[PDB]
Amino acid sequence: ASAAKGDHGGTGARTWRFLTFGLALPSVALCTLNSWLHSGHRERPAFIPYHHLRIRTKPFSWGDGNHTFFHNPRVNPLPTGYEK
Amino acid sequence: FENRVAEKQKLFQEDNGLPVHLKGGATDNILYRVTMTLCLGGTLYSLYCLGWASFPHK
Amino acid sequence: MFINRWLFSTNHKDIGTLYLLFGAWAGMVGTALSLLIRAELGQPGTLLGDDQIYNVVVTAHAFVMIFFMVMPIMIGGFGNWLVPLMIGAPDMAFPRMNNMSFWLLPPSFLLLLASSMVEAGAGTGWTVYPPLAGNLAHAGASVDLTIFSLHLAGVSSILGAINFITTIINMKPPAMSQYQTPLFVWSVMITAVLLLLSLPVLAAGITMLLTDRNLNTTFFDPAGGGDPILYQHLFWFFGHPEVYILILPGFGMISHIVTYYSGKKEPFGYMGMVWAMMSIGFLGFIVWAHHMFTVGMDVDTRAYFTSATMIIAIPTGVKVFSWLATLHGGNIKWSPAMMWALGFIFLFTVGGLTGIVLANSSLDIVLHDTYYVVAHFHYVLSMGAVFAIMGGFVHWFPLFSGYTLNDTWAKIHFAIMFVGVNMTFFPQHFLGLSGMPRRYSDYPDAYTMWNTISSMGSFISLTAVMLMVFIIWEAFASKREVLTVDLTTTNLEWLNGCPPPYHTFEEPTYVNLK
Amino acid sequence: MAYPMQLGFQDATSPIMEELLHFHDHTLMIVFLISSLVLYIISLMLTTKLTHTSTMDAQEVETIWTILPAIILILIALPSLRILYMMDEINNPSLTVKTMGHQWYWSYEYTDYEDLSFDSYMIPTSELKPGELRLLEVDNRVVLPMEMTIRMLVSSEDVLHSWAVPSLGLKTDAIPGRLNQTTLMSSRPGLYYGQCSEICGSNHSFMPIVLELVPLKYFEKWSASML
Amino acid sequence: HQTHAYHMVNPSPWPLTGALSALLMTSGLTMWFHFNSMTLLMIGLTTNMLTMYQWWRDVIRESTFQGHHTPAVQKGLRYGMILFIISEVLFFTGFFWAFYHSSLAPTPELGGCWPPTGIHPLNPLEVPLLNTSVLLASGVSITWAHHSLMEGDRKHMLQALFITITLGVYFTLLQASEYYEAPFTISDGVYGSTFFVATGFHGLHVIIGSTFLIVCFFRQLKFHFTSNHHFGFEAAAWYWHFVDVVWLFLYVSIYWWGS
Amino acid sequence: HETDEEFDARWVTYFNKPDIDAWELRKGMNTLVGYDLVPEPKIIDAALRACRRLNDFASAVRILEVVKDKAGPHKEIYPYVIQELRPTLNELGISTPEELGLDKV
Amino acid sequence: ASGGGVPTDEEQATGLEREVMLAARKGQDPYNILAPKATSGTKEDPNLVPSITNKRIVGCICEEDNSTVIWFWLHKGEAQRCPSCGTHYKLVPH
Amino acid sequence: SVVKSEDYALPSYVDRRDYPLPDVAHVKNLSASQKALKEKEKASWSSL
Ligand SMILES: CCCCCCCCCCCCCCCCCC(=O)OCC(COC(=O)CCCCCCCCCCCCCCCCC)OC(=O)CCCCCCCCCCCCCCCCC
Ligand code: HEA
Ligand code: HEA
Ligand SMILES: CCCCCC/C=C\CCCCCCCCCC(=O)O[C@H](COC(=O)CCCCCCCCCCCCCCC)COP(=O)(O)OC[C@@H](O)CO
Numbered sequence A: 001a002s003a004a005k006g007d008h009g010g011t012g013a014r015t016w017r018f019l020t021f022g023l024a025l026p027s028v029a030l031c032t033l034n035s036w037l038h039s040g041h042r043e044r045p046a047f048i049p050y051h052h053l054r055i056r057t058k059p060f061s062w063g064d065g066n067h068t069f070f071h072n073p074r075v076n077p078l079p080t081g082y083e084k
Numbered sequence B: 001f002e003n004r005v006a007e008k009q010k011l012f013q014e015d016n017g018l019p020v021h022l023k024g025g026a027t028d029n030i031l032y033r034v035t036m037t038l039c040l041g042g043t044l045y046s047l048y049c050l051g052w053a054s055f056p057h058k
Numbered sequence C: 001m002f003i004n005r006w007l008f009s010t011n012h013k014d015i016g017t018l019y020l021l022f023g024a025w026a027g028m029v030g031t032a033l034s035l036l037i038r039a040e041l042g043q044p045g046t047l048l049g050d051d052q053i054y055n056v057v058v059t060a061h062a063f064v065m066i067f068f069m070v071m072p073i074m075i076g077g078f079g080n081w082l083v084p085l086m087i088g089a090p091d092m093a094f095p096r097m098n099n100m101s102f103w104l105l106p107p108s109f110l111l112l113l114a115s116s117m118v119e120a121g122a123g124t125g126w127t128v129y130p131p132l133a134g135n136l137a138h139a140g141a142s143v144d145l146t147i148f149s150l151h152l153a154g155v156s157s158i159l160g161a162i163n164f165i166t167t168i169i170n171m172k173p174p175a176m177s178q179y180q181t182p183l184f185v186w187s188v189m190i191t192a193v194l195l196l197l198s199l200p201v202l203a204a205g206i207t208m209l210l211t212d213r214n215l216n217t218t219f220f221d222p223a224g225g226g227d228p229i230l231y232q233h234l235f236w237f238f239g240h241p242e243v244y245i246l247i248l249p250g251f252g253m254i255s256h257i258v259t260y261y262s263g264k265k266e267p268f269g270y271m272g273m274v275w276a277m278m279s280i281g282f283l284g285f286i287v288w289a290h291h292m293f294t295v296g297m298d299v300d301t302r303a304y305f306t307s308a309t310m311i312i313a314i315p316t317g318v319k320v321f322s323w324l325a326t327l328h329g330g331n332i333k334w335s336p337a338m339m340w341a342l343g344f345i346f347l348f349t350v351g352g353l354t355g356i357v358l359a360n361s362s363l364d365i366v367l368h369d370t371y372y373v374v375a376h377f378h379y380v381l382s383m384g385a386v387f388a389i390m391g392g393f394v395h396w397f398p399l400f401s402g403y404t405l406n407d408t409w410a411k412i413h414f415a416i417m418f419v420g421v422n423m424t425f426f427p428q429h430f431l432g433l434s435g436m437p438r439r440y441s442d443y444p445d446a447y448t449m450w451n452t453i454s455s456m457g458s459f460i461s462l463t464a465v466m467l468m469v470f471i472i473w474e475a476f477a478s479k480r481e482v483l484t485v486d487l488t489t490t491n492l493e494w495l496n497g498c499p500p501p502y503h504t505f506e507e508p509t510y511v512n513l514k
Numbered sequence D: 001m002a003y004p005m006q007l008g009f010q011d012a013t014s015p016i017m018e019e020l021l022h023f024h025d026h027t028l029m030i031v032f033l034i035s036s037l038v039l040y041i042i043s044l045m046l047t048t049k050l051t052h053t054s055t056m057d058a059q060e061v062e063t064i065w066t067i068l069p070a071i072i073l074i075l076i077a078l079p080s081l082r083i084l085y086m087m088d089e090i091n092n093p094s095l096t097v098k099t100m101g102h103q104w105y106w107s108y109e110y111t112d113y114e115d116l117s118f119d120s121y122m123i124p125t126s127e128l129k130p131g132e133l134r135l136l137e138v139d140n141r142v143v144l145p146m147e148m149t150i151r152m153l154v155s156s157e158d159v160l161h162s163w164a165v166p167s168l169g170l171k172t173d174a175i176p177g178r179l180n181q182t183t184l185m186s187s188r189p190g191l192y193y194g195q196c197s198e199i200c201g202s203n204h205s206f207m208p209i210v211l212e213l214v215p216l217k218y219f220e221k222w223s224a225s226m227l
Numbered sequence E: 001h002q003t004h005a006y007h008m009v010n011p012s013p014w015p016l017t018g019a020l021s022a023l024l025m026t027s028g029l030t031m032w033f034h035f036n037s038m039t040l041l042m043i044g045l046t047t048n049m050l051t052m053y054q055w056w057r058d059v060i061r062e063s064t065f066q067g068h069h070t071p072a073v074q075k076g077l078r079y080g081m082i083l084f085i086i087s088e089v090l091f092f093t094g095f096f097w098a099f100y101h102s103s104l105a106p107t108p109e110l111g112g113c114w115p116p117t118g119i120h121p122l123n124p125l126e127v128p129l130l131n132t133s134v135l136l137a138s139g140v141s142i143t144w145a146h147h148s149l150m151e152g153d154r155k156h157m158l159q160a161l162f163i164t165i166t167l168g169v170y171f172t173l174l175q176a177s178e179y180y181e182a183p184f185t186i187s188d189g190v191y192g193s194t195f196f197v198a199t200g201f202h203g204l205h206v207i208i209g210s211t212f213l214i215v216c217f218f219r220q221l222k223f224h225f226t227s228n229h230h231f232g233f234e235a236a237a238w239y240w241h242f243v244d245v246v247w248l249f250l251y252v253s254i255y256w257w258g259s
Numbered sequence F: 001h002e003t004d005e006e007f008d009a010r011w012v013t014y015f016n017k018p019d020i021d022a023w024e025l026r027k028g029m030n031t032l033v034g035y036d037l038v039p040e041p042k043i044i045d046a047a048l049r050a051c052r053r054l055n056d057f058a059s060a061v062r063i064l065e066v067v068k069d070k071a072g073p074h075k076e077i078y079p080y081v082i083q084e085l086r087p088t089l090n091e092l093g094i095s096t097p098e099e100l101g102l103d104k105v
Numbered sequence G: 001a002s003g004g005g006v007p008t009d010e011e012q013a014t015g016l017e018r019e020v021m022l023a024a025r026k027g028q029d030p031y032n033i034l035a036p037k038a039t040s041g042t043k044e045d046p047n048l049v050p051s052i053t054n055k056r057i058v059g060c061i062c063e064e065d066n067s068t069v070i071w072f073w074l075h076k077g078e079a080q081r082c083p084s085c086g087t088h089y090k091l092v093p094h
Numbered sequence H: 001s002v003v004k005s006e007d008y009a010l011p012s013y014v015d016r017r018d019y020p021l022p023d024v025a026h027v028k029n030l031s032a033s034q035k036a037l038k039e040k041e042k043a044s045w046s047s048l
């Protein structure tokens, strides 16, 4: 593809700054908007003690051995279920 | 900021026989001594830890 | 000055010397481990203990021989000493990074030694397959120390690979194209490309094993939807290129030794030798699952891996016949190095041919995990890689040291070793064909006779190893200094004298283009 | 089983093992021939004072020693792959038997009809009966009907093992979470021995396999009595 | 005195301190995993950072201040960096192989399906898509920085490099928040294993690449780069494009195809 | 492509060059002995006479030794070559290695 | 806003890098970056081999595409010949 | 006669059956009688 844009003649800083501010950062701004609209917590699902999940073959080397490193009490149940 | 590369070039090309890792001055020697002391003392400590871990501890 | 020179080195020759000393010390460790193996098996019954102590020994034997003896000696040792001299370069591209490749190896070895001292050691096989190597069947620090040992050895070799590739591409005389560089230099370049591509995949696989053991991942644990066979693919994706890494610098040294002691200015068929090493390197990446013919693989996959593996015989045969064509018409000098190289050509070929037997997946069903595999790879490693190491060591010892060996003692040493390795390993073909498994500390009674002979052979090789140490001592003790070396016009590494000065090629060679 | 001073394969007990023997004979002849030719040429190159040290043209002779090895490989690959696919062909078993590897013993399950299963452990050397084989006998053998196509399914409940019977040409890895299939057909009654063939820890050397091949009617009555 | 153009390096202690830092970090991880202690690990991490600092400090002294980087030396460093990136590609290839192996053949323990029963993947159109636009945008801004440097434009080099770094930081902060918010963990079977180890090593490389860009930023502030000689900047840009491309493979494979 | 006779004549011409120098004498002989042949008497004749023009008796003797060496186990070649060279040996006063005792070990 | 502020190599290159740059501008190659082009190599027109001492190693690629390089020390004084092809070389110390 | 380590870059003598005419003479320095012998060698070798 030629994409859909189209501006050479001797490539340069001016063109890449043009791309940075005229395409790249606007796209980041659009995606930032899209993401802030769709954030907001989702219902945490019923806890089911599936045996292929919440694996514990050795205690973790931190904490009480039973909490993952970026444990989030709201959405990460322990092997026994969500914390109080 | 002003461009002071020229004075650094003079400093690091001074004909004083120092190796490049010590050629900045006395701070190089201090940082070297700290690095090497941590490395050698840490290595001795790792050997102590091996000694400890090589035997059962009830 | 001593610390500056030997701990802070940026010199390709001194760093090569460090690697040779390290690899020689590792070779003693690996030899002792091999004698413990063969002592356990030298009569029926149990000598040392059950299969755990036995297979900690077996596992350490392999890691020591491969990672701490062969690769440091061939690549770190002969590679650092010879490659810059053979292209007229003033050092390696990254001379200070080069020194870190060396100094990562004593810590890697310490970690392996630690693995065997803590808990009950890592009794896993050098392949370290889960779940035996996982945290339930090998609970405790030993396997993790083994993983970290491999991590450090892997970083060492990957940075060394970057160094050798850069040096060989970028630091030749401007008139010298890649098709005017010696075959040993080619062999090191191709080995380095294999190292660069394969070791990161090993590193990925052993890191997954580390996280399965310590962070509750389940890459290889079916309870989490993982698969032990995935580990095997990642390991052997590295592990087949690895055996070509172990032999390629050997092929390069053999080309130089055969050329030199045939009184020739050049190997027969130079571009065919380059082609063959590149072809072997390439085909060595697409055959790894011949280590997995019994794991439950589909028939069409078995057919592909059978055929792709067998193809490697064609470029390898070009090299064997080109060595014979180099001898042809030579003024043969029956030096000790030549004896090592002639033994290499024959015994490597025997081991390559039993590898072709094993490539046939239908026969491999019966031969896999038996001593027939052990016989195959000890012919290519103990009578191939090691024969090339000994040949190169004897040939270039006067360059590195400035002193000569006693050639009569060196021929005695070759003779003893040749009897020893063949007595050790030839009977293991019979043990494999008749069904003796690998990694056994004891065997059904029927297998006694060949196990007894094999163990007696291993003691003859011990006597050869001890005599080697005396021979090196005698050379340094007597101090016969080199005078003239012939054929310098086609062996540039000798042209600066013996030993060469600390700095060579400060003025580069003159090579014009025409 | 292997016998003292044995040099080659155990005698074939299955047609597929007989095919492997003939294919091995074919391949070994080629191995011997090439090894001996290389040894002979080495000796030829080394036994004359005549010399020729100027540059030698390589192009013509490299055709020979590329084409001849390619032809030889094809002469190996053709019968090799024929046995591979014959090994793989559909056969329709009469019976399925599972074996599960464990540290350090095998269990067997025959659940086509009834729930039959048992463990099979090495006989300790101190308990061998006179004339029994050290490290090879088990307490409960894998009784099977002779002259019949059997599906063996192989897995493990702990680490890797590998279920091997050399005289039937069988070796199938025992992998937890995986159910590997192989087929077994004995042309003869008898006792056929094998040993665990993947390193599995402290007693890897000591968890053997013993098949006992008998007529169907004996196998049926044995099966019923093992319930 | 030499009459070739290559660099004979002064005898240096950093190879040894680097190797010993590797011993201390690995024996330190062992001590942490098995003997409940972080002591050796913290020493190893410290000596590793000191080693890297003084080693790359010395490379700057040798080139900007002492003039040892002739064109032949620079060409070697170019090959060195390309080969290093190749090795890192193969390292990630092993984790992509693990991901496809497990997801193309989901085992019964998973429910025989991908994503596994009980796994609720992130929506690839929310933060993962935003992270994709961020790294892509930073590939554009680092290219602007490169062209400004070659054209001799100090201010716009600094502006563009600052924007590139800001986007690298933004990606890292977004990824950190996504890690915390994720309802699955590294212990959630092979789904969590492949997800976090692969994106985790990717995140480490983003941090490494961001740090490298920040080093270039301060060397640029100190006028080290000329409009023609600035290999440290080129190497950091190549590494940055490598980090961007690995992300696109992760996004397509793990976040999108594997959802 | 070159017949035997053409090869021999090139080599005769090489050694016959009146002002051949010492370096060219050695280059010629050390190159020639690399080939799979014992040089024809007419080639050796020209090389010996080059030795004479270069006032080098020792190299003439050495050339005779290398003729014997190139024949290997074919013990008939060297006495034949010496027989053919006897008029030149007599004319130039060249003693054979045998006449000088230099065949003794 | 096309401005400046980035030093040039001409302004700021130093040490050996600067030596190489300044010599290349004069068309000189004191640090051996280029392959020298051969003369006819006769005794009358020998290849002239610069050196900062009184001997230098020569490698002779005797014919185009030879993979074998012929290596020898070239000493100050009378021209020497490649031992394989005879082409002449003469040291020019400076 | 005497070969020295510091001569390694100079043309050297070798006895090699396939390099019959080495790059240097075995003996470079001549006594009075050996000089007279090399003069006599310029005359008919039949008179030696
Ligand atoms: C090749 C390595 C160098 C040799 C090393 C040691 C040399 C030992 C000889 C060894 C000298 C070579 C002769 C090898 C065959 C001898 C055994 C045999 O009859 O083999 C039979 C087969 C299976 O066949 C059968 O099922 C039928 C059984 C028939 C029984 C007949 C009774 C035989 C009497 C007992 C023999 C005792 C064996 C001695 C035990 C030997 C203990 C060391 O076993 C096998 O396949 C073994 C597979 C070996 C594969 C590697 C091949 C390498 C060939 C190199 C030779 C080059 C030139 C030789 C000349 C080579 C000279 C260097
Ligand atoms: C130096 C190391 C090295 C080398 C070079 C090789 C080379 C080869 N190997 Fe080997 N191999 C190992 C070291 C090596 N191997 C190791 C260590 C293992 C076991 C790992 C473990 O499980 O621990 C092993 C395992 C191994 C297996 C797995 C067996 C099993 O576990 O069941 C197989 C199967 O195909 C194999 C095949 C081959 C082949 C075909 C070659 C070929 O490259 C050989 C090609 C050479 C020739 C064929 C000889 C010369 C050729 C001629 C004279 C031409 C004419 C020949 C013909 C026409 C055939 N090897
Ligand atoms: C380079 C690799 C290498 C080498 C050289 C050797 C050498 C030897 N090996 Fe090794 N071996 C392996 C790699 C090697 N081995 C591997 C990979 C395995 C499989 C491991 C596993 O199953 O997991 C294995 C397995 C293995 C077993 C099978 C164990 C089992 O299945 O239970 C046996 C048993 O006999 C054995 C024995 C020997 C013996 C007697 C030697 C002897 O030949 C050793 C004799 C001595 C030497 C060869 C000299 C060594 C030293 C030097 C060369 C240094 C020289 C110094 C200077 C040059 C200055 N080995
Ligand atoms: C379980 C945890 C295990 C952890 C193990 C950690 C092990 C090692 C500790 C590492 C300490 C590193 C210290 C800094 C090293 C910088 C090397 C470098 O930058 O090397 C450069 C060459 O490599 C180049 O370019 C390109 C190559 C750059 C490599 C940078 C360092 C990478 C180290 C990790 C590599 C891992 C590869 C992984 C792939 C799987 C320069 O080479 P020198 O010879 O120095 O100089 C030559 C002079 O002309 C320069 O003026």
Ligand SMILES: CCCCCCCCCCO[C@@H]1O[C@H](CO)[C@@H](O[C@H]2O[C@H](CO)[C@@H](O)[C@H](O)[C@H]2O)[C@H](O)[C@H]1O
Pocket (backbone or CB within 6 Å): B046, B047, B048, B049, B050, B052, B053, B057, C110, C111, C114, C141, E027, E030, E031, E035, E036, E037
């Ligand atoms: C180079 C190879 C190195 C291999 C590395 C292997 C791992 C090493 C970490 C082991 O370190 C040891 O851990 C012990 C357990 O944490 C400590 O004892 C501590 O715990 C003991 C047991 O409770 C008590 O006796 C003591 O009070 C207390 O010091 C001990 O001091 C420490 O050194």
Ligand SMILES: C[C@H](CCC(=O)O)[C@H]1CC[C@H]2[C@@H]3[C@H](O)C[C@@H]4C[C@H](O)CC[C@]4(C)[C@H]3C[C@H](O)[C@]12C
Pocket (backbone or CB within 6 Å): B001, B002, E154, E155, E158, E159, E162, E221, G005
């Ligand atoms: C101080 C310097 C002026 C150039 C010079 O020193 O001659 C200017 C020019 C570019 C500036 C940087 C760039 O414009 C990008 C950044 C813009 C932010 O708003 C402030 C920090 C920021 C990082 C600036 C800091 C500082 O004002 C810089 C670095």
Ligand SMILES: C[C@H](CCC(=O)O)[C@H]1CC[C@H]2[C@@H]3[C@H](O)C[C@@H]4C[C@H](O)CC[C@]4(C)[C@H]3C[C@H](O)[C@]12C
Pocket (backbone or CB within 6 Å): C230, C233, C289, C300, C301, C304, E097, E101
């Ligand atoms: C072994 C590897 C699977 C690794 C995995 O399970 O993770 C698979 C992936 C792609 C496969 C290949 C591709 O399917 C293409 C080929 C298919 C042929 O039927 C067999 C050979 C063939 C060349 C395959 C061999 C082997 O099964 C491969 C390479």
Ligand SMILES: C[C@H](CCC(=O)O)[C@H]1CC[C@H]2[C@@H]3[C@H](O)C[C@@H]4C[C@H](O)CC[C@]4(C)[C@H]3C[C@H](O)[C@]12C
Pocket (backbone or CB within 6 Å): C271, C272, C275, C318, D059, D062, D063, D064, D066
């Ligand atoms: C063309 C190339 C290089 C020739 C040169 O520039 O000198 C040569 C070197 C090695 C050669 C190959 C090897 O000699 C091996 C094979 C020999 C067969 O006779 C032809 C194909 C064959 C695969 C050759 C093809 C080709 O002539 C190659 C690849």
Ligand code: CUA
Pocket (backbone or CB within 6 Å): D101, D102, D104, D160, D161, D162, D196, D197, D198, D199, D200, D201, D203, D204, D205, D207
């Ligand atoms: Cu079970 Cu080995």
Ligand SMILES: [O-][O-]
Pocket (backbone or CB within 6 Å): C239, C240, C243
């Ligand atoms: O690996 O063969």
Ligand SMILES: [Cu+2]
Pocket (backbone or CB within 6 Å): C239, C240, C243, C287, C288, C290, C291
């Ligand atoms: Cu392999």
Ligand SMILES: [Mg+2]
Pocket (backbone or CB within 6 Å): C294, C368, C369, D162, D197, D198
């Ligand atoms: Mg197996």
Ligand code: NA
Pocket (backbone or CB within 6 Å): C040, C041, C042, C043, C044, C045, C046, C047, C441, C442, C443
């Ligand atoms: Na035993």
Ligand code: NA
Pocket (backbone or CB within 6 Å): E146, E150, E230, E234
């Ligand atoms: Na640039």
Ligand SMILES: [Zn+2]
Pocket (backbone or CB within 6 Å): G060, G061, G062, G063, G070, G082, G083, G084, G085, G086, G087
């Ligand atoms: Zn020439």
